[model samples]
Target: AGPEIVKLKKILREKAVPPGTEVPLDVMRKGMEKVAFKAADDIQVEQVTVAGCAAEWVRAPGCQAGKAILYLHGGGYVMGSINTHRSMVGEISRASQAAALLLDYRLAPEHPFPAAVEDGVAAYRWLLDQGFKPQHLSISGDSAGGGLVLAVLVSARDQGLPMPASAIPISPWADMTCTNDSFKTRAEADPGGINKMAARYLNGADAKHPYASPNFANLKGLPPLLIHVGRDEVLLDDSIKLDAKAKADGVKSTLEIWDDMIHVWHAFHPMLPEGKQAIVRVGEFMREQWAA
Candidate 1:
């Protein structure tokens, strides 16, 4: 690890939630907003509405207007909004050299299963209606949003919408059923207590439902994927299993595991060097897919 990574590890260790601690929904929502980083100076943000849901447009210098990224912010489908993720999305937009549209999809327990999925697809469909071609766009997200990207893709495919050029899912919570081995092995290492967060989004729905979990969905006919996950994340196996299944089902895919990193470490850019590097790599991957 580099100096930034090492320093970040120490900071994370200090802020680590103790084992068996209870983190309620309200606390998670408020605390995340309180700690969110400030937006960088280089990016411009705009507000918009897509299919009845509020959204934001993030643009950085050198971003190509013809190519766009549809970004979904992770908050277990219950906590995040574009405000909480603007800084992180700004970095990604800067690195990718593409304009990003961040969705403020409806939260769960109020909207429930299929609501997020429906909102995500509606945003993509709105993009298509606005003259953005499938090959000129990519979709991406982290944690619950990560799984959400996949759900959108599958949902679009089933509806006969053209596939996007590619996708990126960072530390995706693909299996809400909690069957992954890392959920057990990395439980002590994960500070997010993701298992606890899953229930809020599930809203009493079946965990294995294709639109809900997405781990059980058919992977055929989807766009190429680039998955990033921390070795120490509780969702490590979620990425691993999805990558394996995607390739097995004949979708071109790449899985990248950052050594000693934590979940959604890419959100820590300008603080952790590895985070910036990962964003750069995501940009490179998107560029390559667009070219192909």
Candidate 2:
């Protein structure tokens, strides 16, 4: 929308990731470090505690209050950690006025498939076990992390744990087979989709894992759900499919598509218009969820 955004979009395009390739464990770690280091500046934003980790906000009488958001970072299940996603948690915490917990889940090439999902579930369970009200908790994530939200939700349901108040998946990669219609139709249009650079990033794990591509899940009794995605993204189908499934199952789910936005563009924050707008929408959703 702005000159700076145009420039950033160009940068993202030129940095397009190629499809269907995998990176080694060392490279993945390095990438995670680079993103995390950049996010440290964002983490200094607020202060709170959840599951023993310093959250960006608190559940009451602080930066933001009323509810807690459990966040998972997205790096296609290969890269990303507490550091890379720290700023994101800070933004969500500050915007939604809710305590936010960022999980440094395990990456692929070493601990693949259910490993990340397990960690995410553990984090959610920890919050509930700590006496945090289930009605005050929501699971939120971006990219691979977004898909993990649904996976964790499914796990919680299966385990007979209390369901969260809501679920938000931003630019979720809900179909790992890379067979979404948009994968080919919008492949060349989205910067974050598999391009020359990214295909080599997903080598160790299968994309079809339920936690990795949650669009395939039996969407029943999921709490209020919000899916944010860009129109031209390769993963749009993830949001689309999930929304449809949730609706079919008689659950409340909303999907918002931004125009000409890159993949999980919220990761850009402060710089991307849709990034800020998405946060506002998330806050609105959080408010309405509690109102019910």
Candidate 3:
């Protein structure tokens, strides 16, 4: 790790929720909302609606109008909006040289279960409806949003939607059952207690439902995937297991684990060198997939 990352690890360690502790939903929500950043002055943002849900089109200078990426923000499915993620999306847009569409999927405890899945699928369908070539589009997300990368894909595939060029799920929370070893062993290592998030998002829905917690879902016929994960996160095993399962189910999945990094380290690209490098790698991978 670099000097910058050492400082970040210290801060995350100091802020991490104690093992076995339970925090209220809003507290977690507001805590994450506190992490806000500004996009570059030249980055353009426009508001639009997709399938009745609010959405935004974010673009950076020299971005290809022909290529697009659909991004979903992460807040354990309870909190997070386009505002909290627009900056990061802008960085990704510029790096990938592709337009990005960030969707405001409804939060949980009010709108729950398939609501987020529905909204994501709708936005994807809207993209397809706009005549965006499937090969020119890709999908991505982080943490809970990372989980949705697969959720939306599997759900969309069942509906017969064509696959995109590729996908990247950073620090994906793919298993809500909390059955993985890392979920148990890395509890204190993660930034916060992610225990209750599954419940909040599930909201009485079945945890094993493929769309809710894609660990159990069929992974065949999806786009190639580039999964980046932190070895220290509680969701580490989710990515590890997901990689194995995707391969077993015949999807080409590549897993990249960063040593000593925290969940969604890409979120800290502005300050962490590794984060910026990861995003750059993501752009290369996305472009490579499109070329094929």
Instruction: Give per-residue CA lDDT, model 1, range 88-195, as digits (tens).
Output: 888888888899999999997678878999999999999999999999999999999999999999999999999999999988988888877897897666663565
Two-way lDDT contest, 1 vs 2, winner: 1
Top-down lDDT ranking = 1, 3, 2
C-alpha RMSD by candidate, in order? 1.4, 3.9, 1.6
User: Which residue pairs come into collision in candidate 1?
Assistant: none
Give the candidates in order of TM-score, highest first.
Answer: 1, 3, 2
For all candidates in order, the CA lDDT equals 0.88, 0.72, 0.87
Predicted candidate 3 versus true structure: per-residue lDDT over 91-197, tens digit per residue? 88888999899999988868888999998899999999999999999999988899998999999999999999899998888888888888678766666345577
- Predicted structure 3: clash tally: 0
Residue 265 miss distance in model 2 (angstroms): 1.2
Worst 10 residues of 1 by lDDT: 188-197
Given candidate 3, what's the lDDT at residue 273? Answer: 91
The predicted structure with the larger TM-score, 2 or 3, is 3
For TM-score, the strongest prediction is 1
TM-score of 3: 0.95
**Total clashing pairs for each candidate:** 0, 15, 0
Error of 2 at 276 (Å): 1.4
TM-score of each: 0.96, 0.84, 0.95
List where candidate 1 sits over 4 angstroms from the true fold: none
